Subunit: 45 residues, 4 copies
């Protein structure tokens, strides 16, 4: 699951995924990938 | 597939998975992960 | 995809998968695992 | 996702996948595998 800090980072990640991998997109859009089924409180977007 | 020993361990695993990986949750909730499509007799929950 | 040589090997594999991994079950039931979407002529079951 | 350069390469890849892996089929049919959800402009088929 990807978990972003802001709505900005969420749009960033989704657009990035058109051509990039999860892991690279998470980094550039300041998002976090988690193994859990829910996002932490601090990465709710 | 995850296979737990008790109902307690099952609730434990399911809640744990909100933020943890299968493998760490199995350990802490005393469950077992199997490659089979069914659970052994001793981990039926 | 699993591809078996006989119907016997097919029942064997399916039952085996209740508790075993694809790779171990293929071996014991004399089946083959393929990356292709179809089975070879010689493993049609 | 697989992304091919021509329709020819697309038919090539799809037929190849009946018996081959993604990675080998991409190579022989001159296609590219991408982690992105969309294909680059130069591999649109």
């Amino acid at each position: 699951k990807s978990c972003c800090k802001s709505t900005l980072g969420r749009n960033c990640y989704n657009l990035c995924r058109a051509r990039g991998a999860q892991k690279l997109c998470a980094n550039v859009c300041r998002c976090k990938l988690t193994s859990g089924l829910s996002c932490p409180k601090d990465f709710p977007k």
